Amino acid sequence: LGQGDFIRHLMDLLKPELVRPATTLYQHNLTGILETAVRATNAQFDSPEILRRLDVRLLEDTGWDVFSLDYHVDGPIATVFTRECMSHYLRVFNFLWRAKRMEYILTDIR
């Protein structure tokens, strides 16, 4: 979440979707929303290569409990991350996602 500008728009577009239960959620729909955010925010001016790996994954309730980004990496660069950094980032990304919706709720009440 070090971008901030991109995650702001991404939390405004997933609001109408994640409120529904997880059973009606299918991954093929959210990708069009993620792709829309990367185009509108400042993340468009970015290396096309790294943007090819950034996608969504569905953890396996409510839509605010199974959504998370993945950024899969394979090849030579995969010897630095080694399937454990990707099992640690997602362990972190939840705590930064919760502490981000608990704030945009409290600026909506305000």
């Binding site: 971008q3 901030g4 702001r8 600026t107 009440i109």
Partner: peptide, 17 residues
């Protein structure tokens, strides 16, 4: 200039009013 926190006017207003 987007950063990490306070990325919206509503964030500004909520923090004061």
């Amino acid at each position: 200039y987007p950063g990490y926190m306070n990325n919206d006017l509503i964030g500004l207003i909520a923090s004061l009013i």
